[PDB]
Amino acid sequence: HAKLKCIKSTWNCCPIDWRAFQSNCYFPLTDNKTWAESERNCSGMGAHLMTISTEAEQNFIIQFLDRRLSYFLGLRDENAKGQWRWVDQTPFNPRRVFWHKNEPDNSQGENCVVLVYNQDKWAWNDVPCNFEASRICKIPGTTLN
Numbered sequence: 001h002a003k004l005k006c007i008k009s010t011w012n013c014c015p016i017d018w019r020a021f022q023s024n025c026y027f028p029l030t031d032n033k034t035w036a037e038s039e040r041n042c043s044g045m046g047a048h049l050m051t052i053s054t055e056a057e058q059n060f061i062i063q064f065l066d067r068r069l070s071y072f073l074g075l076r077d078e079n080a081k082g083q084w085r086w087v088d089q090t091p092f093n094p095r096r097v098f099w100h101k102n103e104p105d106n107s108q109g110e111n112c113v114v115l116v117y118n119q120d121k122w123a124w125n126d127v128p129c130n131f132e133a134s135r136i137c138k139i140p141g142t143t144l145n
């Protein structure tokens with residue numbers, strides 16, 4: 001037994017309780033974890049920390065986020081070289097970033113990114129990967145029929 005929510009021909013499906021947008025399924029989670037613990041939790045559901053490729057994708061997810069919290073995305077720079085990599089292995093596209101003003105601003109250590117609300121706006125902030133925050137898991141949708 002499994003249970004899907006399918007929307008359109010072809011039908012795009014997600015697990016019943018996940019949020020659906022353009023062939024992908026998302027779930028924001030609010031219990032605090034480090035970046036690596038967060039990714040561990042996502043992968044346990046077949047998922048990964050969310051990759052954000054378009055503004056449309058970000059605009060979709062932010063409507064389900066608590067403005068008091070930071071949410072880990074999948075983007076990580078392990079040695080502070082500016083070698084940002086998506087943990088889901090989507091190739092990093094530096095012409096499609098969404099930093100807050102004056103970010104990224106950590107010049108040392110292992111840095112990760114959170115979606116955070118600041119200055120009346122959702123955008124990216126770089127944060128030490130050992131910081132504890134919420135997260136957004138993302139899993140590719142399935143297709144029928």
Ligand SMILES: [Ca+2]
Nearest residue numbers: 105125126127
């Ligand atoms: Ca920062």
